[PDB]
């Protein structure tokens, strides 16, 4: 009953979800700050430094606002995140697998391909690309004679503050200096480190906050410029001493100028037209284009080999996280004997580049004569 | 960052193997294969390779080794990437990284407990060979140009709206004039006495060509 | 016993529960709101962006370019 | 007769449509707000935040107006 | 351009990925709420929740008939290619 985790520390496993503990009811329900309203680079630096020190709430809210506000950023982020979901995967057994190990690996493979909550797990784990860390709870359930998850809820990333000590262990916030640690076997954590460093640093929001600010400020300034451009101000200079009644009619006239407007004014009055916005759209669009290009560079790598390498890298990191926290827990809970930590099934994504069928088909039969070429190596390409 | 990640992910893409020593005997080949399989089946090696790429820009990637007992093999169980600022080069011989201990010489590294990867792109000492030495100048130029360009767009294309009230105007007629001159928006149109003026003076004149030229050169 | 017609009710009639923020509940002028009758509500939550039920719509991202384009036009 | 749902909670299934329950007759018939008339970014942010908090009505009406108004969209 | 980027992904692989993703989400929703209800209502025994029919969309990319036709007979000699796999492309 005293199940050991991956690190070999015995503990007692509890079916109750850590959030639903009747003690964190008033700290798991937070109304979002929306800090991206009127951001100044000084304040963005301040929230980034607060996140670096350990308080990740402001950074997570800022990342969420950046995801939903900047349309180009969202398009690029979705383009990157859907690359991962497209890859086909299988639970390849441990190397030199025996009978039972291969059978258990195949059982896990079939169950995961026939579980509706795995695709949600993979889609939500892609949130760590921008915020830095995707944390999902595991609501354990009884499926026949197998203790397997029945739902993976994606908790808000702002609820987790890094420990002030060792700065790499995500701890659920409990209004404490150290913070409440994660309940074992009940928190699917995927830390996607694009940049080496600590848990708060490795998010792409650190790099993308500046182009986001520049692009959005330029866009708003450009829109306000178009609000005024191409329509000159219409000022009338009534002679001094005019009665208080003749100013009202003059103002109602000068505000009545429309299409083909034409009227009469006394010799003492003037109706000069002064421009209220002079310039062109070249600077605003230049800044917008540069910022969008920078955002695309940060997200994908270039505005096709680089995108493939990005996909392979972050897919490998996700696979390592899954092996840590979605295969070993199932094996340990379902089985009763001490699970061999050295040899356990691991998820593998089919990230191999597709093989051009025509070149292989007109090349292999030519090399085959003379060379023993395994059918399998060839069977890997397509079927 | 995009270029640095593009370079660092090239290394991780390469496949590797623990090739035995040349003219390997039986036992040497078997040990080499054992190491190969163990390292391909250890989760902390990929982290080691990803963190060792930090030396590209800073100059030196230092990772501690938390030794652990795996059956009957004393092998690492976790490689923590310590902050590079904690290490100061020895004032003597200037090539041995020593953990800082508030001392002149500094505490040396504990043996068999510090994975050090000194990526020398340029010949020289440990502090020199980082790419930050070369890249600090284009970084400064590009970022200063970018901030200046953004501040220029903050002001460009919206002329300053100054009103010249005749002197001797009551202290109440200056407030209304200022609230009017700050009420100019889309299709704004109003009346001013003959003695007042509403000249529009530009507050930022120029174009985006120089800023973008400098940004392109720096990139 | 199979469906004979699927009526598309107006999405404004549904308010997310103030608790757990992911269960769509038919609005009944109540704080919690009337829950959906089982086996009688075909619900398809298309999450383009990770988050809650109200967040994952594309209107959140597209409201700004829509405003800018239409004001400019 | 006590059919269980996907989540294994027994219940009684009813053929009557939930809307046609003689209690939600005055809340299933709403005349649309059309909030996209004279939208200011402040007000768009306000309705987005209201939708985030749970009241999805304004967001849905805004999305409908965006769908029928912006031709490219 | 921004609206097109948000909707499709680019103003042709990206559109295919978008279609596959949202079609998969729709298929999961249908399996949750348009197959199990029919099975539970029509049948009287306890429906096996673990094993129930699921809707699948034919999202596989079309196969160029000329390349397959002049490649497979060249590989077939020597390798046991299954007619089925080939039958998936078109008929």
**How buried is residue B131: exposed, middle or buried, by Cβ count under 10 Å (0-12/13-18/19+)?**
middle
Contacts of A328 (CB under 8 A, 6+ apart): A6, A339, A341, A344
| Contact residues, chain E, for A116 at CB < 8 Å | 28, 31-32
> Of the candidates D17, D48, D52, which has its C-beta nearest C63's C-beta?
D48
* Of A40, A85, A39, the residue nearest A65 (C-alpha): A39
| Contact residues, chain E, for C23 at CB < 8 Å | none
For residues C19 and C41, what is the distance between their CA atoms, to the nearest angstrom? 20
For residues A244 and C53, what is the distance between their CA atoms, to the nearest angstrom? 59
Please judge whether A32 and D52 are an interchain contact, meaning their C-beta atoms are less than 8 angstroms apart: yes
**Chain C residues bordering chain D (beta-carbon distance below 8 Å):** 9-18, 21, 26-29, 34, 36-41, 52-55, 57, 59-60, 62-64, 66-67, 69-70
| Contact residues, chain D, for A32 at CB < 8 Å | 52
Please judge whether A357 and E71 are an interchain contact, meaning their C-beta atoms are less than 8 angstroms apart: yes
Tell me, rounded to whole angstroms, the distance of Cα B149 from its chain centroid: 21
| Contact predicate A158/A56, CB 8 Å | yes
* Of B51, B62, B50, B40, the residue nearest B12 (C-alpha): B50
Q: What is the crossing angle of helices A205-228 and C59-72, to 10°?
A: 30
For residues B197 and A237, what is the distance between their CA atoms, to the nearest angstrom? 9
Tell me, rounded to whole angstroms, the distance of Cα D11 from its chain centroid: 26
For residues A49 and A43, what is the distance between their CA atoms, to the nearest angstrom? 10
**For A123, which residue in chain E has the nearest alpha carbon?**
E21
> Of the candidates C42, C47, C58, which has its C-beta nearest E6's C-beta?
C58
Please judge whether C62 and E29 are an interchain contact, meaning their C-beta atoms are less than 8 angstroms apart: no
For residues A189 and B144, what is the distance between their CA atoms, to the nearest angstrom? 39
Geometric angle at alpha carbon A336, from A331 and A340, rounded to 5°:
55
Tell me, rounded to whole angstroms, the distance of Cα A247 from its chain centroid: 59
> Of the candidates A194, A196, A238, which has its C-beta nearest B81's C-beta?
A196
Token pair belonging to A124: 């939500």
For residues A139 and C22, what is the distance between their CA atoms, to the nearest angstrom? 15
- Largest interatomic CA distance in chain D: 54
Taken in order D21, D22, D26, D32, the sign of the CA dihedral is positive
Token pair belonging to C57: 């719509």
Whether C and E touch (3+ CB pairs < 8 Å), yes or no:
yes
Geometric angle at alpha carbon B46, from A115 and A161, rounded to 5°:
70
- Beta-carbon count within 10 A of A176 CB: 10
Please judge whether E28 and A362 are an interchain contact, meaning their C-beta atoms are less than 8 angstroms apart: no
Phi, psi of A152 (to 5 degrees): -120, 105
Q: State whether residue B189 is helix, strand or coil.
A: strand
Taken in order B102, B103, B105, B107, the sign of the CA dihedral is negative
Whose structure tokens read 């501690």? B64
In terms of DSSP H, where are the helices of chain A? 41-53, 57-69, 71-86, 99-113, 117-125, 128-131, 205-228, 244-254, 282-299, 305-322, 328-334, 357-368, 375-380
**How buried is residue A31: exposed, middle or buried, by Cβ count under 10 Å (0-12/13-18/19+)?**
exposed
* Of A270, A276, A234, A255, the residue nearest B195 (C-alpha): A270
Please judge whether A225 and B157 are an interchain contact, meaning their C-beta atoms are less than 8 angstroms apart: yes
Measured CA to CA in angstroms, residue A370 lies from A358, A364, A366, A374 at distances of: 21, 11, 9, 13
For residues A42 and D14, what is the distance between their CA atoms, to the nearest angstrom? 60
- Which secondary-structure segment (H or E) carries B56? helix B55-58
Contacts of C57 (CB under 8 A, 6+ apart): C48, D59, D63
Pairing assessment for the beta strands A233-238 and B189-193 based on DSSP bridges: parallel
* Of D57, A71, D71, the residue nearest C48 (C-alpha): A71
For residues B129 and A90, what is the distance between their CA atoms, to the nearest angstrom? 43
Q: Output b/e per residue, B69-83; b: 16+ Cβ within 10 A.
A: eeeeeeebeebebee
**Chain E residues bordering chain D (beta-carbon distance below 8 Å):** 3-4, 7, 32, 36, 40-41, 46, 49
| Contact residues, chain C, for E22 at CB < 8 Å | 46, 48
Sheet holding B73-81, edge to edge: B73-81, B61-70, B114-117
For residues A68 and B121, what is the distance between their CA atoms, to the nearest angstrom? 41
Phi, psi of A176 (to 5 degrees): -130, 155
Contacts of E8 (CB under 8 A, 6+ apart): E14, E15, E18
Geometric angle at alpha carbon A144, from A138 and A147, rounded to 5°:
30
Gap from A338 CA to chain C (nearest CA, Å): 37
Distance separating the N- and C-terminal Cα atoms of chain C: 52
* Ramachandran assignment for A376, one of left (phi > 0), alpha (psi -120 to 50 degrees), beta (any other): alpha
Contacts of A331 (CB under 8 A, 6+ apart): A104, A108, A339, A344, A345
For residues B33 and A95, what is the distance between their CA atoms, to the nearest angstrom? 13
| Contact residues, chain E, for C39 at CB < 8 Å | 37, 40-41
Measured CA to CA in angstroms, residue B152 lies from A75, A219, B125, B148 at distances of: 28, 14, 42, 6
* Of D11, C24, A117, A141, the residue nearest E31 (C-alpha): A117
Please judge whether A320 and B195 are an interchain contact, meaning their C-beta atoms are less than 8 angstroms apart: no
Please judge whether B190 and A323 are an interchain contact, meaning their C-beta atoms are less than 8 angstroms apart: no
> Of the candidates E14, E50, E75, which has its C-beta nearest A143's C-beta?
E50
| Contact predicate A105/A93, CB 8 Å | yes
For residues B149 and B153, what is the distance between their CA atoms, to the nearest angstrom? 6
- Beta-carbon count within 10 A of E88 CB: 12
For residues D48 and A299, what is the distance between their CA atoms, to the nearest angstrom? 26
Pairing assessment for the beta strands B200-201 and B160-161 based on DSSP bridges: antiparallel
């Amino acid at each position: 009953g005293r199940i050991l985790d991956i690190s070999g520390q015995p503990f007692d496993f509890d079916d109750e979800m850590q959030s639903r503990s009747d003690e964190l009811a008033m700290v798991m329900k937070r109304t979002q700050e929306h800090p991206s309203s009127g951001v100044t680079p000084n304040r963005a630096a301040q929230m980034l430094r607060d996140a670096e020190r350990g308080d990740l709430t402001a950074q997570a809210d800022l990342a969420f606002d950046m995801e939903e506000k900047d349309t180009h950023l969202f398009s690029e982020l979705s383009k990157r995140r859907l690359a991962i979901q497209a890859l086909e995967w299988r639970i390849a057994p441990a190397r030199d697998a025996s009978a039972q190990e291969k059978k258990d690996a195949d059982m896990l493979n079939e169950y995961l391909h026939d579980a509706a909550w795995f695709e949600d797990a993979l889609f939500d784990a892609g949130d760590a690309i921008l915020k830095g860390y995707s944390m999902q709870e595991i609501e354990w359930g009884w499926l026949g004679k197998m203790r397997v998850p029945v739902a993976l809820h994606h908790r808000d990333p702002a609820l987790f503050c890094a420990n002030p000590d060792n700065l790499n262990e995500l701890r659920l916030r409990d209004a404490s200096y150290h913070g409440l640690e994660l309940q074992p076997f009940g928190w699917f954590m995927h830390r996607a480190k694009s940049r080496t460093g600590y848990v708060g640093t490795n998010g792409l929001v650190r790099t993308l906050i500046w182009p986001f600010i520049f692009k959005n400020y330029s866009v708003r300034d450009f829109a306000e410029f178009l609000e005024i451009y191409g329509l000159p101000m219409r000022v009338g200079k009534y002679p001094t001493g005019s009665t208080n009644r003749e100013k009202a009619t003059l103002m109602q006239a000068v505000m009545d100028i429309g299409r083909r407007a034409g009227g009469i004014i006394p010799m003492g009055m003037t109706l000069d037209f002064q421009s209220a916005a002079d310039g062109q759209s070249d600077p605003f669009m230049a800044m917008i284009g540069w910022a969008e290009k920078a955002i695309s560079k940060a997200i994908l790598g270039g505005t096709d080999e680089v995108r493939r390498e990005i996909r392979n890298a972050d897919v490998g990191q996700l696979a390592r996280s899954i092996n840590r926290d979605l295969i070993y827990p199932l094996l340990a809970l379902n089985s009763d004997s001490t699970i061999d930590i050295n040899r356990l099934p691991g998820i593998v994504f089919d990230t191999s580049e597709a093989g051009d069928i025509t070149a292989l088909s007109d090349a292999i039969p030519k090399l085959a004569a003379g060379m023993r070429i395994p059918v399998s190596w060839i069977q890997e390409k397509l079927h």
